[PDB]
């Protein structure tokens, strides 16, 4: 006699909770836009860095897990050093050349966290300028930055990794050929551990801040999620050219 709408009861059960946009009007639009744009360009840079690393001689020779590990530990080193290089190559005081269409002036940075990060980057840029680092030295130093951190217990292809890293150190010495220069450039490589540690800290802070809810692209988000614990686990071993 009376047909019940049985499926509507199941349609009710499966209806998901309303999604939140994450929108907070207290955060200025300019702020939200530059952070979001920087994260988006940043994500695209990690992709570029992964395709670059797959093309580095010796790199493909390591175990897939070690390649994975090295990329997860070094993505911020590669990005910060390339940013220092492009800013140095622009020659303008206090300008950070994130991209040819996104040249930030640190003197226009109103957000204090971003202002602090930019000042460290200006030290990287200032150092490449003081030392007049050539493009050839830069390429060698960038490759060494991919091989600067390892896991506490080491890699699966440790012997081969050490052989490959050794090869790139030798490569840097040849490109320069005064030994003094080597000490100074490897000292600049060593100082990048501190720079990156501050950049990762600001990045991790923003990534977890659910009130600001700045957007992050998918791949940057996975790499940050995998790394955060390690940056507290004491699982990262920094490789130093010099003491200490």
């Amino acid at each position: 006699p009376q047909l019940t709408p049985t499926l509507v009861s199941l349609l009710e059960v499966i209806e998901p909770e309303v999604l939140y946009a994450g929108y907070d009007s207290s955060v200025p639009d300019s702020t939200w836009r530059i952070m979001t744009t920087l994260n988006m360009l940043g994500g695209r840079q990690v992709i570029a860095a992964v395709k670059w690393a797959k093309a580095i001689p010796g790199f493909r020779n390591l175990h897939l897990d070690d390649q994975m590990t090295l990329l997860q530990y070094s993505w911020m080193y590669l990005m910060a050093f390339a940013l220092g290089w492009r800013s140095y190559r622009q020659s303008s005081a206090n300008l950070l050349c994130f991209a040819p269409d996104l040249i930030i002036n640190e003197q226009r940075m109103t957000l204090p966290g971003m202002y602090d990060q930019c000042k460290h980057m200006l030290y990287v840029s200032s150092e490449l300028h003081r030392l007049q680092v050539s493009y050839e030295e830069y390429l060698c130093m960038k490759t060494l930055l991919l091989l600067s951190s390892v896991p506490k217990d080491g890699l699966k292809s440790q012997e081969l990794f050490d052989e490959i890293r050794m090869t790139y150190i030798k490569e840097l010495g040849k490109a320069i050929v005064n030994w003094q220069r080597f000490y100074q450039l490897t000292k600049l490589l060593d100082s990048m551990h501190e720079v990156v540690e501050n950049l990762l800290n600001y990045c991790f802070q923003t990534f977890l801040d659910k009130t600001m809810s700045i957007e992050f692209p998918e791949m940057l988000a996975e790499i940050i999620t995998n790394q955060i614990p390690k940056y507290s686990n004491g699982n990262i071993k920094k490789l130093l050219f010099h003491q200490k």
């Binding site: 992709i47 897939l64 994975m68 791949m219 999620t225």
Partner: peptide
């Protein structure tokens, strides 16, 4: 991890 892995495996 996963997105990185399939990029590396390509």
């Amino acid at each position: 991890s996963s997105r990185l892995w399939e990029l590396l495996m390509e």
